[PDB]
Ligand binder design. Structure first.
Ligand SMILES: [Mg+2]
Lengths: 69, 603, 1340, 29
């Protein structure tokens, strides 16, 4: 269901938004989960270009620069 | 930080933090005094409690702030914020360069602009103005520039017209739902404190004019100007993203105009004559010679581009009215006269716009659209449609229908008095006849109201669809509906007692007559439940869109063609009868999974 | 006919005669508070009752007691007028005499000493104004009456959703007026439970044990006894012939030598008739039937002294032997039926962990206060303290009455605490209900909704104030020394005073008065609220209680309620409704005896009304008042049907009584859909008054009542003739029948002049009477704002045309002719209070001196020497109202700044400019200035002038009083002296002062001369003392806040006219916002050339079904017609005869209306004046549901010379061409709501910022930016515009760096952003890191 | 939890000193 599927999201900052924060932060903090951003909710929080629309060009240029050398 | 009157105000963490320290420090002391265990233990427990209250308060006891009952807020409560889940990106953030106020009409506007108060625009662009003022050297330095505009020297207004010209502003209304809740416009300086808003757009915003306020935002960075112009500009979104149908379709006055424009009565000034072309049709009309609606043959030239990128021309004699002839001046190019030769209701008038778009492209649809509005208001203005109390016509037969249905209920009552029918069976019974009666009165008054204009051309009589005001409104699609009309003239409904049963003595009066005490009182329950119901269905909708964007959000068109042949088989919905929704609408704009055959194949 | 009735008469349609006239609409607010503060020599609510409950306070057993004597309210420190200006509360000191008794230690009780401390002061309680409003801090606040759940017992269902098995449940709730709640509830297993307050559920019987009930007496209480006899041998049984109904035979049942029933045949009424009539008391039963029957009491073996079976235990065939062989003749068992008499309690005991009273008391105490060790004294004391203590529990009268009532008791009055019988009785009823006998009540009925109101509410808070003082008092009597202390040193003030202050001040029931306007006032004051303390909340209650109920008829207005988050949580009070003696809502009705309709009125409550059959407000009766039709529509019990001619017990008093004053003012309401009607009465209150009070052209007839009942107008106290009329005051010389013998008198009305409303309107009175005019008691002397000649005018009616006008009226937009703005008719006056505060900073005191750094003399022009703007100076935005300068030392300028002063040679001041200046854009005239000073700082020059000025004005006013007063009194002496000693020319010669010497022949008239002397001398001195206090009140150093040396309040009167953007609406729920202001040239005009004021869009009408707005237009037109007609004959100056004929013609209008009329009126002075008042239009009255009809309108349009269609030909003022089709033109009353656009308009470029998070924040009222929320963000995400979004939430807002870095580029002309990181998130980072979490930003 | 309780009970174990016991300990000191 939507509300259940929306529960699982790789970015923890995103989950920390709409889910219950304490639980999100802890359960992440133990695993040393590394948020790579890449999503919308999260990029807005930290306040940079949305990896869509106008930014979609950008993220593209960075995402490939990442995992690169 | 201090306050006025010398009072101080502080965050609650201090109260918390202070405690962890005290308790902590006491413990350090209690070790060098080698206190008994029962004590250092207790101190240790207290130290734990204090840290807990500091970190996340409420998982044990909820310590309360000093002298103030309200529990002091801990760091965990700092992160959560409140209003459900909102981290200050989610609830909202205040923003500079913005403003807001009440909005009004402005029919003169082109669809791409909006009325903005002079002062709002002064204060909004203040930094931009400063920069242009000293770019031309009208102000020695930045300070003086401030002093000038603060002084409102006559020269700045002209400067504001420069910085405004190409510089869109974002306009936004309160419940932003689809992306059309924010659209970009080009500013036009307006005396007055109200925002003027292009009528055609009023539909997309769901903005009535009853005092709705809109907020304005200035896009600052260049990229915001170019984003605004190529994305959020009004003209670039003319079609609803929900379904391809145009969302700019003229609303109510304009559709009453065009309907009143193209409509025809049976006998009218100028009936039967012939004209070379629309130019002289308007020339006939404006002069008082010919009626707006009279059946007339006129020569028109339509065009069809059905060649290869190429417009065919054809001229012929069309049998039409004066109004359709006049209107033809607006339809650009490609389109056939066939599109205007009808009565031009709201539905057709939209597909007019639609075809115009899907054929000629964007620019013509815009400019077409502007023209349609200007002309719509205008001729509607000429028409003088109004509504008086005698425009709502009650059937002559109403009292008689009620009386018969009143015999039926008294018959079934006698059948219940004699036990021929059960109580439950009775309730359904009386309701059935009353329900049926109302339909009868409705389709009675509808027959009289719709066509009863009964008129004569050179002969005795003939009868056409009424020119009565209120019918024109409902027929056109402007406003009103057979349902609401039925409550005006025919009896209104059978109300329902709060528990949900529906009363078996309907409301026999209507609004043209008076409702008496009892009847009004009964109407109240339905009324009150509506407002209550709507305000809640409002909340549910909002809740649903929330979950919805949450489950999707990050999904974006990324690759070009994944190149899978895979796909679903589309058929029209065909429910039990014929075609509750066609195939042509289901497949439009989608892409075929595989080549499709004629009935023969290798075709 | 009265005097303000001769000026203007409203032509009244409608048939039904008014049998009862609307009582005072403000009763509730006034009556209530009157009971609160009052001396009642008994327990009726008031300070006495709240005193008498908690007093006397006795020490703890110490036989040191403090009792309560009496109370009084001292005169207010400041009057009402001063209290708003100053900012304080209108209050009186509460002085209460206390009596301290000390019992000789180890009494027989007798007192060592009793010190009576004279009236120790506790708190100042606010006072209610003559109009029913309160002033808390300079702000009028009204307290809405509350509607809550009646104290008592309530039996509910709660079927459906729980457990999804159906089965319902039945719960009872005992709700006391004060003290803990007692809940009983079932479960799916039919186990009886109790919960105190909302606390943990506990098995019910546990309280009975705590009431000192052993298991045996519980069974004996709730169950009947089945008697078993072992007589001869083997098991006989006692049989009640009725017990066998509803059960089938388990064996052959035979007795009395006649076999009544065999095995397997159910026992019906036949068997029962047989048994009853054959009177078979005793039968023989088998030994196996008791295998299931549960034993009632305990049964032991007589010999061995061992327990055979405990009470409430299920017997077995083996067990019967063991108690039988013990010599037991009788065995008692339970009567149990799963249909009729459930076996609930028995199984409830089985879930009960307790056994004995102390056991039960313990389980309760640890339930209520868990975690702490129970103690014997603790379980006993608490439990005795919950419901049985006169202190902690009361149902009061209402609770006990409904309680006893729901229990089918007789007594309507009894104890205020609970008795074992009470709890027991309630449990019995719940079980009786679960058994099927009885029904559940419903909360929504108005017999269960009780109405409180201010008086009671203040008493409750005050009561809490007294208990919290009680604890303290005991605390002092703990240690007390005999003779040192007295009843002062103990009782504090602030606790009680701030307790009471928090009530009127911040309470869910306390509110501002937002806009001035009589209907709004008068409509709040009769407001009901189901919210607040002791009420539900929006989140708590769903649609059932919000919904309209049948008991609401005539009690609550169905159609006036707010539309919004709380719907139906407000309603409003109905027209004729009244608060019950006990506090329910009762409404007026007419007693129909036999077949005649009697004019005796009778007030029936919701339950009283239930049984009677009540006729309908709309009915035809005649002559003797026999119902004309043989059968008539009525509503009897919760339902309405046709009723026989003589069945009806009562009939509706009026046709209005269903609605409220708000709704009753909507003409042709019967013609509007209810949704829009609500909206209408909702919007009508927002009407800001206008400059010229117009009058409704189309109307109802309440407008007289609204003007008068609200105190806005000024009504004559006693009848007489006007001596003096000034725009300032009005003096009436009283007539002798109304005059009291002593003091003689004249009534002097001091009119209110231009003054401040609760922000920001102006409240100003105009005299409506002329020099030397007859006034009758109860006539309007002067209109207030929005009152015209005694009627209610919220606006000005105007000529309106329905037609699309080039889209400028597009949605609801209203298109207005310039004539309106020129006519200044919709212009409005606002009075704003600006203040300048001179505080104290650690750097130094702030000066109001007029020497202000960096300003030319032109600025300083508008100021006196002192720094205060002169009174009367017209000002605009930026003007200096008050010069103020605050010390800031050592500016620490910078190198280039130091050079700058060096070149231009300016001495940079040790002082910074704090001066109060006019807000941007707002412009007005100064009507006043006030100066408050801390006690001890020397008052400056200007301020001193003021003190001198106010002083002289007071002296002038008081003196004027005394002068008219003295003249009035001596003028009476002149008249009494002329009887028995008349000297006409002789008497008025000698000095008036020497009159007191002349006596009279022996008579009462000499003693009458005596009377007038006394009152004269009192007045002579009353004046003296009155002046002194005033002088003292002026000169007294005003109390200020901490830190403030002096304050200057400047009063601006802004005049706003009208502009695109303002909200306007008619009474019909048609809102609108003026779009364009049109030249008179483009206005549609008719053939006669008279333009039309407003052009409304017709498209709005069908969709929103408010058809009244159309009738109001038509009738509106006709009304204006009769005016125009008269306007010609008066300009023709025909004569009284010609005029008289036509007016009479109008007031009759063809048949069967209730109005009556003239030629009794004085044919000259009276008719011509009336005609002068009718020429603007003929005021018409459409009663709400009795209102006029089309024909009458058509008939009234016939007299007019104007067409019946109500439509005419209209011509566009532009082309001059005609308009196809006729358009409706007429006169609609239209209001200006106060949303006025130059409030709403706001814009911000770069403003102040929040400290904690750097974010736009309005600090100057240069407003914080608009809030870009979650939803708006999504909108940008759907477009692909990221940069717009980035710039929105970073540089345009949150980046303390990026924001300035941007601005510098914007002026440079480079549009870029160098964003950096939003500070919001930057804080989240430290906040996470402040916890134990290491959160890092990786890579690159 | 709520350490007042786990304290109150932890000390509540300790028995009050007899008038003689005080001196004993004091002597021990
Ligand atoms: Mg609206």
């Amino acid at each position: 269901g939507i509300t259940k599927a929306s529960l699982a999201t790789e970015s923890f900052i995103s989950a920390a938004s709409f889910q219950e924060t304490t639980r999100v932060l802890t359960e992440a903090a133990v695993a040393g989960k590394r948020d790579e951003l890449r999503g919308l909710k999260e990029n807005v929080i930290v306040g940079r270009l949305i990896p869509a629309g106008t930014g979609y060009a950008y993220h593209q240029d960075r995402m490939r620069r990442r995992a690169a050398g | 930080v201090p306050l006025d009157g010398g009072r101080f105000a502080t965050s609650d963490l201090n109260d918390l933090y202070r405690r962890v320290i005290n308790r902590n420090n006491r413990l350090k002391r209690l070790l060098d005094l080698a206190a008994p265990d029962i004590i250092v233990r207790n101190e240790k427990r207290m130290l734990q409690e204090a840290v807990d209250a500091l970190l996340d308060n409420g998982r044990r006891g909820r310590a309360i702030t000093g002298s103030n009952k309200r529990p002091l807020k801990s760091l965990a409560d700092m992160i959560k914020g409140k209003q459900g889940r909102f981290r200050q990106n989610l609830l909202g953030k205040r923003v500079d360069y913005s403003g807001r106020s009440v909005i009004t009409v402005g029919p003169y506007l082109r669809l791409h602009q909006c009325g903005l108060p002079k002062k709002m625009a002064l204060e909004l662009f203040k930094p931009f103005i400063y920069g242009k003022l000293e770019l031309r050297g009208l102000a020695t330095t930045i300070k003086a520039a401030k002093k000038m505009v603060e002084r409102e020297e006559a020269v700045v207004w002209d400067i504001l017209d420069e910085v405004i010209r190409e510089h869109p502003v974002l306009l936004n209304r309160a419940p932003t739902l689809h992306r059309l809740g924010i659209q970009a416009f080009e500013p036009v300086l307006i005396e007055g404190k109200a925002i003027q808003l292009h009528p055609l757009v009023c539909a997309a915003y769901n903005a009535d004019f009853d005092g709705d306020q809109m907020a304005v935002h200035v896009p600052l960075t260049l990229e915001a100007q170019l984003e605004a112009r190529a994305l959020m500009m009004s003209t670039n979104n003319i079609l609803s993203p929900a379904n391809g149908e145009p969302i700019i379709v003229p609303s109510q006055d304009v559709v009453l105009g065009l309907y009143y424009m193209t409509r025809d009565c049976v006998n009218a000034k100028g009936e039967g004559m012939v004209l070379t072309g629309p130019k002289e049709a308007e020339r006939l009309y404006r002069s008082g010679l010919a009626s707006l609606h009279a059946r007339v043959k006129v020569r028109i030239t339509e065009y069809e581009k059905d060649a290869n990128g190429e417009l065919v021309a054809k001229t012929s004699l069309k049998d039409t009215t004066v109004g359709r002839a006049i209107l033809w001046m607006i339809v650009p190019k490609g389109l056939p006269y066939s599109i205007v030769n009808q009565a031009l209701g709201k539905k057709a008038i939209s597909k007019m716009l639609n075809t115009c778009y899907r054929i000629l492209g964007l620019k013509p649809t815009v400019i077409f659209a502007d023209q349609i509005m200007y002309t719509g208001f205008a001729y509607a203005a000429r028409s003088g449609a109004s509504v008086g109390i005698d425009d709502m016509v009650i059937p002559e037969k109403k009292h008689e229908i009620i009386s018969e249905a009143e015999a039926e209920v008294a018959e079934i009552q006698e059948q219940f008095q004699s036990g021929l029918v059960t109580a439950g069976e009775r309730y359904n019974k009386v309701i059935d006849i009353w329900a049926a009666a109302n339909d009868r009165v409705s389709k009675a008054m509808m027959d009289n109201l719709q066509t009863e204009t009964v008129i004569n051309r050179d002969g005795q009589e003939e009868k056409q669809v009424s020119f009565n005001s209120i019918y024109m409104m409902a027929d056109s699609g402007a406003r009103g509906s057979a349902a609401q009309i039925r409550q005006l003239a025919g009896m209104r409904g059978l109300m329902a007692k709060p528990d949900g049963s529906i009363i078996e003595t309907p409301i026999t009066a209507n609004f043209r007559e008076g409702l008496n005490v009892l009847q009004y009182f009964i109407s109240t329950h339905g009324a009150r439940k509506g407002l209550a119901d709507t305000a809640l269905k409002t909340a549910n909708s909002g809740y649903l869109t929330r979950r919805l964007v949450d489950v999707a959000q990050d999904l974006v068109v990324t690759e070009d063609d994944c190149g899978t042949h895979e796909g679903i088989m589309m058929t029209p919905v065909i429910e039990g009868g014929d075609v509750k929704e066609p195939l042509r609408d289901r497949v439009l704009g989608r892409v075929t999974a595989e080549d499709v055959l004629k009935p023969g194949t290798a075709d | 006919y009265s005097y303000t009735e001769k000026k203007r008469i409203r032509k009244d349609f409608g048939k039904r005669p008014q049998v009862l006239d609307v009582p005072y609409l403000l009763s509730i607010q006034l009556d209530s508070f009157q009971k609160f503060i009052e001396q009642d020599p008994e327990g009726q609510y008031g300070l006495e009752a709240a005193f008498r409950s908690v007093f006397p306070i006795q020490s703890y057993s110490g036989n040191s007691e403090l009792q309560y004597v009496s109370y009084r309210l001292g005169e207010p420190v400041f009057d009402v007028q001063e209290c708003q200006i100053r900012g304080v509360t209108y209050s009186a000191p509460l002085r209460v005499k206390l009596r301290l008794v000390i019992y000789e230690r180890e009494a027989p009780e007798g007192t060592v000493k009793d010190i009576k401390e004279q009236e120790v002061y506790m708190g100042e309680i606010p006072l209610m104004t003559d109009n029913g409003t309160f002033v808390i801090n300079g702000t009028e606040r009204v307290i809405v009456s509350q509607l809550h759940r009646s104290p008592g017992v309530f039996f509910d269902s709660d079927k459906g959703k729980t457990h999804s098995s159906g089965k319902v449940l039945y719960n009872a709730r005992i709700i006391p007026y004060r003290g803990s709640w007692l809940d009983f509830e079932f479960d799916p297993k039919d186990n009886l439970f109790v919960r105190i307050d909302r606390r943990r559920k506990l098995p019910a019987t546990i309280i009975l044990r705590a009431l000192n009930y052993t298991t045996e007496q519980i069974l004996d209480l709730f169950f009947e006894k089945v008697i078993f006899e072992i007589r001869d041998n083997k098991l006989q049984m006692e049989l009640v012939p009725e017990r066998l109904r509803g059960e089938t035979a388990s064996f052959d049942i035979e007795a009395n030598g006649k076999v009544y029933v065999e095995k397997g045949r159910r026992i019906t009424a036949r068997h029962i008739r047989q048994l009853e009539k054959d009177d078979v008391k005793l039968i023989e039963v088998p030994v196996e039937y008791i295998a299931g029957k549960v034993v009632a009491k305990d049964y032991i073996d007589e010999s061995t002294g061992e327990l055979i079976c405990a009470a409430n235990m299920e017997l077995s065939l083996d067990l019967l032997a063991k108690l039988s062989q013990s010599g037991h003749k009788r065995i008692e068992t339970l009567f149990t039926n799963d249909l009729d008499h459930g076996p609930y309690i028995s199984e409830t005991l089985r879930v009960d962990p307790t056994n004995d009273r102390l056991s039960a008391l313990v389980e309760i105490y640890r339930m209520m206060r868990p975690g702490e060790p129970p103690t014997r004294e603790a379980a006993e004391s608490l439990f005795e303290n919950l419901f049985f203590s006169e202190d902690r529990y009361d149902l009061s009268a209402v609770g006990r009455m409904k309680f006893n009532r729901s229990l089918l008791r007789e007594e309507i009055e009894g104890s205020g605490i609970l008795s074992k019988d009470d709890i027991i009785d309630v449990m019995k009823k719940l079980i009786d209900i679960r058994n099927g006998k009885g029904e559940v009540d419903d909360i929504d009925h108005l017999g269960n909704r009780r109405i409180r109101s201010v008086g009671e509410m203040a008493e409750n808070q005050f009561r809490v104030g007294l208990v919290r003082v009680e604890r303290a008092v005991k605390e002092r009597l703990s240690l007390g020394d005999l003779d040192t202390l007295m009843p002062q040193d103990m009782i504090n003030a602030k606790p009680i005073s701030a307790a009471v202050k928090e009530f009127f001040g911040s309470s869910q029931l306390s509110q501002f008065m937002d806009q001035n306007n009589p209907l709004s006032e008068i409509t709040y004051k009769r407001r009901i609220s189901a919210l607040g303390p002791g009420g539900l909340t929006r989140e708590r209650a769903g649609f059932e209680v919000r919904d309209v109920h049948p008991t609401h008829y005539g009690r609550v207005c169905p159609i006036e309620t707010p539309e919004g988050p709380n719907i139906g949580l407000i309603n409003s009070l109905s027209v004729y409704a009244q608060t019950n003696e006990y506090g329910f809502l009762e409404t007026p009705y007419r007693k129909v005896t036999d077949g005649v309709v009697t004019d005796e009125i009778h007030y029936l409550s919701a339950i009283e009304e239930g049984n009677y059959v009540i006729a309908q407000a709309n009915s035809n009766l005649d002559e003797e008042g026999h119902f004309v039709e043989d059968l008539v529509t009525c509503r009897s019990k919760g339902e309405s049907s046709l009723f026989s001619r003589d069945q009806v017990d009562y009939m509706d008093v009026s046709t209005q009584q269903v609605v409220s004053v708000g709704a009753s003012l909507i003409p042709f309401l019967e013609h509007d859909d209810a949704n829009r009607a609500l909206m209408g009465a909702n919007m009508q209150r927002q009407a800001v008054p206008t400059l010229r009070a117009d009058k409704p052209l189309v109307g109802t007839g309440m407008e007289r009542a609204v003007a008068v009942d609200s105190g806005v107008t000024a009504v004559a106290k006693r009848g007489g003739v006007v001596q003096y009329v000034d725009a300032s005051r009005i003096v009436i010389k009283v007539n002798e029948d109304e005059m009291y013998p002593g003091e003689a008198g004249i009534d002097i009305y001091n009119l209110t002049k231009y003054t401040r409303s609760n922000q920001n309107t102006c409240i100003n009175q105009m005299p409506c009477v002329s020099l030397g005019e007859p006034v009758e008691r109860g006539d309007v002397l002067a209109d207030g704002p929005s009152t015209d000649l005694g009627e209610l005018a919220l606006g000005q009616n105007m000529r309106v045309a329905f037609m699309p006008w080039n889209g400028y009226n597009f949605e609801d937009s209203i298109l207005v002719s310039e004539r309106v703005v020129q006519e200044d008719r919709f212009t409005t006056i606002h009075i704003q209070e600006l203040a300048c505060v001179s505080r104290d900073t650690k750097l130094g005191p702030e000066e109001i001196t007029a020497d202000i750094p960096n300003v030319g003399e032109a600025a300083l022009s508008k100021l006196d020497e002192s720094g205060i703007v002169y009174i009367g100076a017209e000002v605009t935005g930026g003007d200096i109202l008050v010069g103020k300068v605050t010390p800031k030392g050592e500016t620490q300028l910078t190198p280039e700044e130091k050079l700058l002063r060096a070149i231009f040679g300016e001495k940079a001041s040790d002082v910074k400019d704090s001066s109060l200046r006019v807000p941007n854009g707002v412009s007005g005239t100064v009507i006043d200035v006030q100066v408050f000073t801390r006690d001890g700082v020397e008052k400056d020059k200007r301020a001193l002038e003021i003190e001198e000025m106010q002083l002289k004005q007071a002296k002038k006013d008081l003196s004027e009083e005394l002068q008219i007063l003295e003249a009035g009194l001596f003028s009476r002496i002149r008249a009494v002296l002329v009887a028995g000693g008349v000297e006409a020319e002789k008497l008025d010669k000698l000095p008036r002062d020497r009159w007191l010497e002349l006596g009279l022949t022996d008579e009462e008239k000499q003693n009458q001369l005596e009377q007038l002397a006394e009152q004269y001398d009192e007045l002579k001195h009353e004046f003296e003392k009155k002046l002194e206090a005033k002088r003292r009140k002026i000169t007294q150093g005003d109390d200020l806040a901490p830190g403030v040396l002096k304050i200057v309040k400047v009063y601006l009167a802004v005049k706003r006219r009208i502009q695109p953007g303002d909200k306007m609406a008619g009474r019909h729920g048609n809102k609108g916002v003026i779009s364009k202001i049109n030249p008179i040239e483009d206005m549609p005009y008719d053939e006669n050339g008279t333009p039309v004021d407003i052009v409304l869009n017709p498209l709005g009408v069908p969709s929103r079904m408010n058809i009244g707005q159309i009738l109001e237009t038509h009738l509106g037109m006709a009304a204006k017609g009769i005016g125009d007609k008269i306007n010609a004959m008066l300009k023709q100056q025909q004569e009284v005869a010609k005029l008289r004929e036509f007016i009479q013609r109008a007031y009759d209008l063809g048949a069967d209306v209730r109005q009556k009329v003239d030629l009794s009126t004085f044919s000259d002075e009276e008719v011509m004046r009336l005609a002068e008042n009718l020429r603007k239009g003929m005021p018409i009255a459409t009663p709400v549901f009795d209102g006029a009809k089309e024909a009458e309108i058509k008939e009234l349009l016939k007299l007019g010379d104007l067409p019946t269609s109500g439509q005419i030909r209209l011509y566009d003022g532009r082309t001059g061409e005609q308009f196809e089709r006729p358009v409706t033109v007429g006169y609609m009353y239209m209001l200006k709501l106060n949303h006025l656009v130059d409030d709403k308009m706001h814009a911000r470029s770069t403003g102040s910022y929040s400290l904690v998070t750097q974010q736009p924040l309005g600090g100057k009222a240069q407003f914080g930016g608009q809030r870009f929320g979650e939803m708006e963000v999504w909108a940008l995400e759907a477009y692909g515009a990221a940069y717009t979004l980035q710039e929105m939430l970073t540089v345009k807002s949150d980046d303390v760096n990026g924001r300035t870095k941007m601005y510098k580029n914007i002026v440079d002309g480079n549009h870029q952003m160098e964003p950096g990181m939003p500070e919001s998130f930057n804080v989240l980072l430290k906040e996470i890191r402040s916890l134990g979490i290491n959160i890092e930003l990786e890579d690159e | 939890t709520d350490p007042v309780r786990m304290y109150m009970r932890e000390m509540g174990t300790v028995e009050l000193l007899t008038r003689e016991g005080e001196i004993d300990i004091a002597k021990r000191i």
